Amino acid sequence: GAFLDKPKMEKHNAQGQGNGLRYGLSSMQGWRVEMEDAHTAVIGLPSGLESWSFFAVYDGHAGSQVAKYCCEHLLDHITNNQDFKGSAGAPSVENVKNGIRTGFLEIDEHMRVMSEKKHGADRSGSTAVGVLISPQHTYFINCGDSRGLLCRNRKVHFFTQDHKPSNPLEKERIQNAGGSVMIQRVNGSLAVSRALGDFDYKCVHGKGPTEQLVSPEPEVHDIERSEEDDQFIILACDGIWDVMGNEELCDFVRSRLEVTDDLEKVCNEVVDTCLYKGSRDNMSVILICFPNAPKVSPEAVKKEAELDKYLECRVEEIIKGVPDLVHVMRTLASENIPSLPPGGELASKRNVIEAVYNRLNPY
Ligand SMILES: [Mn+2]
Ligand SMILES: [Mn+2]
């Protein structure tokens, strides 16, 4: 358990386009000593799933080994089993849902034998959250306390339910496998009830793979796609959700998209806003936009430039000792400034305020 002295605020990004989609992503180490988040983003899938896409965020714990194996290999474990393939034609919803379950259980066991065989020292685990997108369905996948959501028609249409040890059915499984839930933790240690890896928590005799202290079983939800109404999907680790809620972030992302179509930038902005809202964890966001995502608006761009200029003049005037940035931020908050981004608040404007502060007080 250690934090860095100062956060590693450096961004790792990707982006792409195809199958009517556009995506951006951003990942940042932040205040933590290691980076244990991993991701997947592929448009167009092997073996005849050209018109399919896959996006996933993995939040690694006690190492990045499991998360990194998952990020390169969960997809083929899901599509390359007989449950997914199943029926001779195009996979049915059940084939897809079963294929994913099997993919999760098989990669877990696969990693377990690799660890046993090679005498592996790490005792890592990882959450997974993602979407498999077909031409007519969005299949949400969740295992752990990473979270995904769908914005349809300017609202949160669906979000994944985090697997927390104290959730009634999780708690039950844990207690049946000989453990307990202490406050929010499996036996007072583990803050998640579902994950890949964590093999010390999967050693209960007389219980199946999905009946252990920690379960690798995913939750899958089929959502019929809507060309008219579907706007965007957000996937992120708990380093994001710990400080922003579903409605807030969805409102925030909308506001950003009305100013840029640069999706990596929107994602940088989310991650930075979350660092400034007090998040001290690793942060990873993926943003998948559909054709009817919010568009850039001439007024929105202007309003934002007006706000930027306004905050610059406020910083200049506040500086007139010389107040430090913490004190400038404090003064600005107490002003109750109108028209700040929804959900992002003053935190979402810190880079603009600090750039100004740095121009006036560079030493
Ligand atoms: Mn982690
Ligand atoms: Mn985390």
CATH code, domain with 332: 1.10.10.430
Q: Check whether residue 212 and residue 320 sit in a common domain.
A: no
CA of 194 to the centre of ligand 1 (A): 14
Contact 284, 25 (CB under 8 A): yes
Q: Check whether residue 234 and residue 328 sit in a common domain.
A: no
Q: Check whether residue 219 and residue 166 sit in a common domain.
A: yes
Q: Check whether residue 231 and residue 345 sit in a common domain.
A: no
Which ligand has an atom closest to residue 61 CA? 1
Q: Check whether residue 246 and residue 357 sit in a common domain.
A: no
Gap between the Cα atoms of 245 and 243, Å rounded: 7
What's this structure's resolution in Å?
A: 2.3
Contacts of 10 (CB under 8 A, 6+ apart): 28, 29
**Domain count for the chain:** 2
Q: Which helix (H) or strand (E) holds 156?
A: strand 155-159
Which ligand has an atom closest to residue 146 CA? 2
Beta bridge partner(s), residue 40: 56
Q: Check whether residue 290 and residue 308 sit in a common domain.
A: no
CA of 185 to the centre of ligand 2 (A): 15
CA of 32 to the centre of ligand 1 (A): 9
Which ligand has an atom closest to residue 281 CA? 2
Q: Check whether residue 192 and residue 322 sit in a common domain.
A: no
CA of 119 to the centre of ligand 2 (A): 27
* 60 is known to lie in a ligand binding site: yes
Which ligand has an atom closest to residue 145 CA? 2
* 281 is known to lie in a ligand binding site: yes
CATH number, position 213: 3.60.40.10
Q: Check whether residue 301 and residue 286 sit in a common domain.
A: no
What is the extent of the structural domain holding 158?
A: 1-294
Which two structure tokens, joined as six digits, stand for 246? 């579903």
What value, to the nearest 5°, has the Cα angle with vertex 352 and ends 350 and 358?
95
Q: Longest Cα pair distance anywhere in the chain, in angstroms? A: 76
CA of 251 to the centre of ligand 1 (A): 26
CA of 59 to the centre of ligand 2 (A): 6
What value, to the nearest 5°, has the Cα angle with vertex 145 and ends 144 and 146?
100
Which ligand has an atom closest to residue 242 CA? 2
Q: Check whether residue 316 and residue 182 sit in a common domain.
A: no
Q: Check whether residue 262 and residue 353 sit in a common domain.
A: no
CA of 155 to the centre of ligand 1 (A): 29
CA of 282 to the centre of ligand 1 (A): 7
Q: Check whether residue 360 and residue 265 sit in a common domain.
A: no
Which residues fall inside 5 Å of ion ligand 1, going by CB?
A: 36, 59-61
Which two structure tokens, joined as six digits, stand for 115? 């660890």
Q: Which of 294, 318, 340 represents a domain boundary (last residue)? A: 294
Which two structure tokens, joined as six digits, stand for 59? 């939040």
Q: Which helix (H) or strand (E) holds 17?
A: strand 3-18
Which strands, in side-by-side order, build the sheet including 3-18?
3-18, 21-32, 283-289, 230-236, 147-152, 155-159
Q: Which of 294, 319, 336 represents a domain boundary (last residue)? A: 294
* 308 is known to lie in a ligand binding site: no
- Positive or negative, the CA dihedral 331, 238, 189, 32 is negative
CA of 151 to the centre of ligand 1 (A): 26
Gap between the Cα atoms of 135 and 232, Å rounded: 15
Exposure b/e, 11-28, CB count within 10 A at least 16 = b:
beeebbeebbbbbbbbbb
Q: Which helix (H) or strand (E) holds 37?
A: strand 37-45
CA of 35 to the centre of ligand 1 (A): 8
